[PDB]
Amino acid sequence: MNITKPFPLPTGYFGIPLGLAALSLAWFHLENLFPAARMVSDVLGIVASAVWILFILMYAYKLRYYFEEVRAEYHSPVRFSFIALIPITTMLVGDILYRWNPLIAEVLIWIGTIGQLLFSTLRVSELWQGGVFEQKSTHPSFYLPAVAANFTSASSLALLGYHDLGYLFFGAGMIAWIIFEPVLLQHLRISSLEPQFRATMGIVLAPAFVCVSAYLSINHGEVDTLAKILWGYGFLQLFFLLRLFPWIVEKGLNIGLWAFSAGLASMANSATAFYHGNVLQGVSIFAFVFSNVMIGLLVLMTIYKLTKGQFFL
Amino acid sequence: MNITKPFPLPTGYFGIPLGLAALSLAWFHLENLFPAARMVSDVLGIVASAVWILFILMYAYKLRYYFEEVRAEYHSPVRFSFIALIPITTMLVGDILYRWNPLIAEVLIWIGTIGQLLFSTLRVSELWQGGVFEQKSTHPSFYLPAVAANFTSASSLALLGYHDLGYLFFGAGMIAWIIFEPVLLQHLRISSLEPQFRATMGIVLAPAFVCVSAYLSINHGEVDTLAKILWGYGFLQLFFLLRLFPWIVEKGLNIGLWAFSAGLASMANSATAFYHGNVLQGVSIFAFVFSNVMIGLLVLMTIYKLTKGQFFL
Amino acid sequence: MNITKPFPLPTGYFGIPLGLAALSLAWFHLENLFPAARMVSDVLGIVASAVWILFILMYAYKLRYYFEEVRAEYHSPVRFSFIALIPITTMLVGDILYRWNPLIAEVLIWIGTIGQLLFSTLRVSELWQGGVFEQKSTHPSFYLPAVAANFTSASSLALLGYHDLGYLFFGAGMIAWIIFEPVLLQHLRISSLEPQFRATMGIVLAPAFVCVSAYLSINHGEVDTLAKILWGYGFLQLFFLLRLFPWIVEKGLNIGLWAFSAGLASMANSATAFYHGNVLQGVSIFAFVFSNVMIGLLVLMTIYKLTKGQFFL
């Protein structure tokens, strides 16, 4: 036996239900046009919710029995960010469940919103005390607490009818994104990331697409100048990351590639709005199909790894 | 006697009339709803104006008789920024006086606008020559010449009826803010500030709230998507700074805490617009009351220090 | 004879047809108000096109016979950016030619759009692998592939009737600008540029003005809040650069000053829209006259250098 061993569920694995849940919601937003999309959405949503329940129970066990492992990830100026996946996914599962039970959905949405805001207020701000975060801590994962969590609150609160509160969270996320990205890309240019962190390059896809998806959730799918602007930068980053992909996976394909699923799923979700708004419909179809294929491949890779006993640690 | 001694009025003390003047204007913008607000506004405005006159005379004496002390602050890549408080407050006193004498108000507004634009044009640009500003010069005080001064011109010019000119200054300030903040927050994460500078952390509260207050001044109080976005990031920063407050005041409460008053007063001012627009009225009431209490505490602390002979150097 | 010698046309000389072509387009947009502007526009456009043809042929010769010289500029994390001038100018010549032959214009616009997007996708993204770009590589020239090229595609695609595609390129450029500038200005504050690179300070004038010109091209000249905001920051930078000009030219006037022509020409172009929108007409006239005088001086300086055998290497 081992004196200690890393917990079998890495915190980052919450990216799996994140990607699936967000994709569920994208398909939900096609039911208006193609009713069969609802079936696809419901299946994705149930799968995402089941995985989320499992991973929540797993993390509760980690908290109870391996608390010092949680404490170390929490105080790390790099690893803390993955904890934000927990409230993010809680909110997304709420959004799914709203179709069946708005009361339970609302409870999950508030828990995740309060949770994420408390988390950032405690930890993101603490970094400003200096001396712990280093230049080498400037990782794409920082987008999770700083940006993605706020966008998720924005769209979830809008779903509940709190549009103006949603706009506050939206603004927090959008300005936080624009304020962080400059220093991230400069860091990547000079130093980049070591292979072990490179899959997290996929999170760089997320901001513009998660931003526009949240924006369109609040504004009832009105595809305006801001929405088009966001899509343009989002596609620029997609092209860049496609070119970089062989480098990203230099040391092999791995489960970390779920990092891409936040941007991919939000590409799909926002595409449904562009399509329905009759804006760039051809691009929209491409984006929706591309992102589904990509996430499909992540799912097949993940099943392969599970099949081989190479998923949990 | 002393060969030399620091001048008794630190340049930063212009933050006192700044906070009071801006708060006067917030109360002025409640007269529409509650006429008694005018009395509160007039008292704040008179007090702010009297303090400003005193401090202007004091600084004129510093210029005449201690010019090398001014020169050293001016050429410092850190301390130069506080000089921008002079034209900022000149403009704010003009805005107050407009209620009684638009001619004198207009003169003050132009003096402060020309003054601040000349100041930045001379000094902010000079930094781009390199070799003087250092990484450790990356302080929140830079927001004063770069951001706050432009927003103040924007709203003061709008008051005079020059809305389109006001939008030019508004854009200068808003884009300058977004262009500086990324590097400021990265610096704070890595190095932070020494206790002696930490109260200036309060200036980090200012940008979003000063921005939205200026925006709403130009646009006749129309609370739109941009306004809501700005408030959201503003409240994020408020939460962060509240969490950081014990650290900010690690070495004790001090007069430097007037740094917070620009953001606090602009929180109050913008709240009056949100309230009147029937947007987030409960948040608005909270924000207005909170910021008044906070500034009230600054005033009581300041009276205490004066009472004890611990205000002037 | 020499074993090797730098090619006689520096890649940066494509800034000459850029400035002239963009200025042609500014005058074109005055024909509505003053028909004689068309003659001025046509002359500028023909001159720009002729120079562009020459320089394209020259660069094709460089590619064929001095390929390793191109390869070295391409792989440089600093010098690669000037290559973007080639597709940028290709697009601008297309915009000119559209007045006479929309078919040929469309071909040039697509070639330049595909070319610039391929170029950035290959090279700008590659920088994110780290270890090649250094802090000292943080130069204004980076705006050429990252920002200017996207804005040029935006307005050229709008000219062809592809407004929504144009908005995608517009957003890519605008967000890329805001994401790069923070780190550029911090670098200039700390380290600046050596005299040999200082003329490229002129490119700092470009972003806001090129941005607003592209925006107004897409949106049919509607001078709205965004347009005014952009002009305000653009003029701030103009003032800063005017103050810095003696420093910029410390070691003498040189052909590198064509770096300013992208911002100058776009100042002129956007002024035509402000004027026609009856927004800040006096500022507009000033801006249009100023930028024409400036570019006129660049032309006279260039003729002088050609006259003296000091243009080509």
Ligand SMILES: CCCCCCCCO[C@@H]1O[C@H](CO)[C@@H](O)[C@H](O)[C@H]1O
């Ligand atoms: C998702 C939940 C993450 C929470 C991690 C909490 C980190 C706790 O932090 C610790 O709390 C201890 C008390 O229990 C204190 O003794 C320590 O000072 C502090 O490190």
Ligand SMILES: CCCCCCCCO[C@@H]1O[C@H](CO)[C@@H](O)[C@H](O)[C@H]1O
């Ligand atoms: C997803 C929601 C997680 C919130 C739980 C965090 C509670 C931990 O406790 C808090 O953590 C601090 C964080 O910097 C520690 O310094 C202190 O113990 C305390 O402030």
Ligand SMILES: CCCCCCCCO[C@@H]1O[C@H](CO)[C@@H](O)[C@H](O)[C@H]1O
């Ligand atoms: C960081 C990039 C932010 C860009 C924000 C774009 C400014 C908003 O764009 C606005 O869109 C409106 C609706 O489409 C139009 O009516 C306005 O004319 C336009 O200015």
Ligand SMILES: CCCCCCCCO[C@@H]1O[C@H](CO)[C@@H](O)[C@H](O)[C@H]1O
């Ligand atoms: C977000 C993108 C998902 C929507 C995919 C819709 C694909 C349907 O395809 C479209 O069907 C239309 C009739 O309904 C036809 O007029 C179009 O030619 C066809 O492209």
Ligand SMILES: CCCCCCCCO[C@@H]1O[C@H](CO)[C@@H](O)[C@H](O)[C@H]1O
């Ligand atoms: C609010 C006003 C601040 C102005 C500070 C001015 C700094 C002056 O600067 C100095 O000017 C001198 C001449 O008087 C020159 O001898 C010096 O070179 C220069 O340092």
Ligand SMILES: CCCCCCCCO[C@@H]1O[C@H](CO)[C@@H](O)[C@H](O)[C@H]1O
């Ligand atoms: C609030 C308005 C203050 C403007 C006064 C500044 C005048 C000082 O004089 C100017 O100052 C320069 C600034 O870099 C010095 O280098 C030079 O003396 C001169 O340019």
Ligand SMILES: CCCCCCCCO[C@@H]1O[C@H](CO)[C@@H](O)[C@H](O)[C@H]1O
């Ligand atoms: C840095 C963050 C900048 C965000 C700017 C928000 C873009 C403007 O937002 C615009 O607001 C208008 C009025 O409410 C709406 O009519 C438009 O639909 C919306 O795009």
Ligand SMILES: CCCCCCCCO[C@@H]1O[C@H](CO)[C@@H](O)[C@H](O)[C@H]1O
């Ligand atoms: C910017 C916030 C300052 C405005 C404070 C207004 C507080 C008044 O209070 C409000 O009065 C209303 C009637 O006038 C009632 O309908 C509301 O229930 C009550 O909250």
Ligand SMILES: CCCCCCCCO[C@@H]1O[C@H](CO)[C@@H](O)[C@H](O)[C@H]1O
């Ligand atoms: C405007 C056009 C610029 C293109 C520059 C291309 C840089 C080419 O790059 C080179 O390509 C070679 C093959 O020809 C390879 O041998 C090299 O690995 C690679 O350096």
Ligand SMILES: CCCCCCCCO[C@@H]1O[C@H](CO)[C@@H](O)[C@H](O)[C@H]1O
């Ligand atoms: C203006 C349009 C120029 C596009 C031509 C570039 C083609 C060069 O070839 C490409 O260049 C790479 C760039 O990083 C090299 O690494 C590889 O050869 C290849 O990817």
Ligand SMILES: CCCCCCCCO[C@@H]1O[C@H](CO)[C@@H](O)[C@H](O)[C@H]1O
């Ligand atoms: C980086 C700076 C981005 C600023 C974008 C400004 C947000 C858009 O500004 C919008 O302009 C519209 C048309 O004029 C107005 O109708 C809206 O009220 C206003 O919010």
Ligand SMILES: CCCCCCCCO[C@@H]1O[C@H](CO)[C@@H](O)[C@H](O)[C@H]1O
């Ligand atoms: C982009 C700026 C270029 C336009 C320059 C136009 C200058 C014309 O000048 C204007 O002519 C008007 C009548 O046409 C008069 O009413 C105005 O007084 C005069 O300033």
